[PDB]
């Protein structure tokens, strides 16, 4: 039986720790360039604040939908390199995951739930955390009233 969090095997511990560091760095460089200059504020020149920058850098990495898109030169450079980074990494994961599966299957074979059971705990755990965060916000404002 495989480890609960065995879906993180097609990449090394040092690549996940570095992906998080690169994510944080990109989201703080994107914010910086967009909003540092005081010759663009009217209201803010764009919607790329610190909170939104994390969201757009997480969304970009997950190859998901849009809410905003950089419109400056400096900001677009950050976007471009981040998209290229994501491409390689996501391709590498899928490619190396298939390697793991194919070599393991040569030494039906439909992926059992035990193989991918940590993405479900994380999912329900995040849903649990999300509700809790919402209720903390609600309780705070409710008491203030």
């Amino acid at each position: 039986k495989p480890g609960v969090f065995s879906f993180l095997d097609p990449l090394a511990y040092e690549i996940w720790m570095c992906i998080v560091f690169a994510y944080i760095g990109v989201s703080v460089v994107l914010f910086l360039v967009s909003r540092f200059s005081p010759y663009e504020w009217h209201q803010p020149p764009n919607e790329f604040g610190i909170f939104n920058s994390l969201w757009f850098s997480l969304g970009a990495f997950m190859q998901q939908g849009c809410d905003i898109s950089p419109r400056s030169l400096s900001g677009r450079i950050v976007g471009g390199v981040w998209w290229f980074f994501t491409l390689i990494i996501i391709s590498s994961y899928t490619a190396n995951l298939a390697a793991f599966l194919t070599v393991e299957r040569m030494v039906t074979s439909a992926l059992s739930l035990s193989n991918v059971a940590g993405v479900f705990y994380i999912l329900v755990g995040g849903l649990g955390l999300a509700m809790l965060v919402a209720l903390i916000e609600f309780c705070y404002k409710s008491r203030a009233e």
Partner: protein
């Protein structure tokens, strides 16, 4: 209200199904011993595994458990903490429903009901996942008790959205009066 009736009927249905599941022994039709022996068809469950079509038809024996990270999962599956927890949360959801018909000025009770039902649904998912994952170490088919638990989840989640809407409607009415 017609909407209130749906929630009440749906709450009871969810609770009923889930409790019937945890208590019955028709979760996984497998082929193993029930008492060196033979592997007659059996209908395992959560707390017991009772062979079905066998010489000792109707003999039921406590599921043999425990045969640190692996230890944690064993304890979670053995105690059925999550399936049981879902029942408890579904029960409390019904109590909340049967409390906004008396203290109908609060309206936070209905929101509690919603969160309870929605959180009882999430507990049910983890219970299913833990059950399917411990059955790892050919002829494993799922029965009606397993699908009653799964059916309860859908019924619970539907009550959850319905309750949130019921809560939202209360506040929308209060906003119009102001």
């Amino acid at each position: 209200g017609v909407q209130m009736l749906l929630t009440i009927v749906g709450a009871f249905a969810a609770f009923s199904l889930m409790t019937i599941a945890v208590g019955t022994d028709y979760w996984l039709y497998s082929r193993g011993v029930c008492k060196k022996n033979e592997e007659v068809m059996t209908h395992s469950g959560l707390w017991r595994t009772c062979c079905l079509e066998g010489n000792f038809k109707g003999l039921c024996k406590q599921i043999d458990h425990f045969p640190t990270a692996e230890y944690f999962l064993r304890a979670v599956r053995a105690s059925s903490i999550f399936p049981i927890l879902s029942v408890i949360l579904l029960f409390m959801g019904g109590l909340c429903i049967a409390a906004s018909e008396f203290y109908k000025t609060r309206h936070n009770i209905i929101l509690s009901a919603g969160i309870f039902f929605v959180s009882a649904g999430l507990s049910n998912i983890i219970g299913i996942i833990v059950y399917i994952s411990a059955n790892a170490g050919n002829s494993y088919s799922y029965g009606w008790s397993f699908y009653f638990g799964a059916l309860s989840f859908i019924i619970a989640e539907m009550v959850g959205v319905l309750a949130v809407h019921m809560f939202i409607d209360r506040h929308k009415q209060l906003r119009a009066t102001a």
